[PDB]
Enzyme design. Structure first.
Site, PDB file in Angstrom:
ATOM      1  N   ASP A 195       0.778  -1.213   0.000  1.00  0.00           N
ATOM      2  CA  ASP A 195       0.000   0.000   0.000  1.00  0.00           C
ATOM      3  C   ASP A 195       0.809   1.261   0.000  1.00  0.00           C
ATOM      4  O   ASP A 195       1.230   1.696   1.089  1.00  0.00           O
ATOM      5  CB  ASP A 195      -0.964  -0.034   1.185  1.00  0.00           C
ATOM      6  CG  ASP A 195      -1.869   1.190   1.210  1.00  0.00           C
ATOM      7  OD1 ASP A 195      -1.996   1.935   0.241  1.00  0.00           O
ATOM      8  OD2 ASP A 195      -2.462   1.411   2.271  1.00  0.00           O
ATOM      9  N   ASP A 211      -1.618   5.712  -5.665  1.00  0.00           N
ATOM     10  CA  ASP A 211      -2.131   4.813  -4.648  1.00  0.00           C
ATOM     11  C   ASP A 211      -2.387   3.387  -4.987  1.00  0.00           C
ATOM     12  O   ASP A 211      -3.445   2.949  -5.467  1.00  0.00           O
ATOM     13  CB  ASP A 211      -3.281   5.545  -3.961  1.00  0.00           C
ATOM     14  CG  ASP A 211      -3.541   4.862  -2.626  1.00  0.00           C
ATOM     15  OD1 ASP A 211      -2.930   3.809  -2.375  1.00  0.00           O
ATOM     16  OD2 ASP A 211      -4.380   5.313  -1.855  1.00  0.00           O
TER      17      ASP A 211
END
Length: 320
Positions: A34, A216
């Site tokens: 992430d 992201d």
């Protein structure tokens, strides 16, 4: 000075996860890597949530290297929240051995968000400025100890859903077409940089005058301001579904418009195929409404992304 490759697997274009080991001897967890967060954690045998029972639980009684820290960790994923305690132990990612790494151990993971998710835990890859207090990002440790060949990692997402790879310490010319374009990081927390405009056919539909965007991996969609993201749905012909979504006829793919991001003077287009998800004869808009832009997997699938902590830059090249 090393290089680890971590093969990613996809839970359907929505989750790209990989294996890591925690402890001595090593326990295996599947981690969503992430770039949108900096903290690392896994469910623990101290979690009695059903999300926990449905996943891999860290058993610290089985690890010689384990060390409770006490320090507490709270994070949000989706609409879901996790409660945990900070600890130390060794993490192996590929042949990279990361000793004495702060890790969160879930105590609490209530709700369905975590239950049905494919990953057991999350490994955060943003700047330490975003990490929890007393928590040290994994990539910072590896960097601090010269465990990586270079101060960067590379992510390829296969559209074709098979060959996804995380590259630690290296850049692989095989996963892109062309040359890489370097992009300066504006604000070092998220991996943030300036998008110059969003265009359809030479017309700025979005991000008029320039806009801030974060790369992201933990986001599946293309997320932006409501106002702009509706002009894009009206433009591609996305209608709201009854279930609340934005639907697109899978057929009409042909005449739909290509969305072009201009970033550092170079243009990055997304065709209808890239921004269009198709599940069982239902097609879905990759665009989603939230001031900042979140370029999630939708963009990354099209664009090999390098994250450069040495030089604090984003490099982007067209993916294979």
């Amino acid at each position: 000075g090393e290089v680890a490759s971590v093969p990613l697997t996809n839970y359907l274009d929505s989750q790209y996860f990989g294996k890591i080991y925690l402890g001595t001897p090593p326990q295996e967890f599947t981690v969503l890597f992430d770039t949108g967060s900096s903290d690392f954690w896994v469910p623990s045998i101290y979690c009695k949530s059903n999300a926990c029972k449905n996943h891999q639980r860290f058993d610290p009684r089985k690890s010689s290297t384990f060390q409770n820290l006490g320090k507490p960790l709270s994070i949000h994923y989706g609409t879901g929240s996790m409660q945990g305690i900070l600890g130390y132990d060794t993490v192996t990612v590929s042949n990279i051995v990361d000793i004495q790494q702060t890790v969160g151990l879930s105590t609490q993971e209530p709700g369905d968000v975590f239950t049905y998710a494919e990953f057991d835990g999350i490994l955060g890859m943003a700047y330490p400025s975003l990490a929890s207090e007393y928590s040290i990002p994994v990539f910072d440790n590896m960097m601090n100890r010269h465990l990586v060949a270079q101060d960067l990692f590379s992510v390829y997402m296969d559209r074709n859903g098979q060959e996804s790879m995380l590259t630690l310490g290296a850049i692989d010319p095989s996963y892109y077409t062309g040359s890489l374009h370097w992009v300066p990081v504006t604000v070092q927390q998220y991996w943030q940089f300036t998008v110059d405009s969003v265009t359809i056919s030479g017309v700025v539909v979005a991000c008029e005058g320039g806009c801030q965007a974060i790369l992201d991996t933990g986001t599946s969609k293309l997320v932006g301001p409501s106002s702009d993201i509706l002009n894009i749905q009206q433009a591609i012909g996305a209608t709201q579904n009854q279930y609340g979504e934005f639907d697109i006829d899978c057929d009409n793919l042909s005449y739909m418009p290509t969305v072009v991001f201009e970033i550092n003077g170079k243009m990055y287009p997304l065709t209808p195929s890239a921004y269009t998800s198709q599940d069982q004869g239902f097609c879905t808009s990759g665009f989603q409404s939230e001031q900042k832009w979140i370029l999630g997997d939708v963009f990354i699938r099209e664009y090999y992304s390098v994250f450069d902590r040495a030089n604090n830059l984003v490099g982007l090249a067209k993916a294979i």
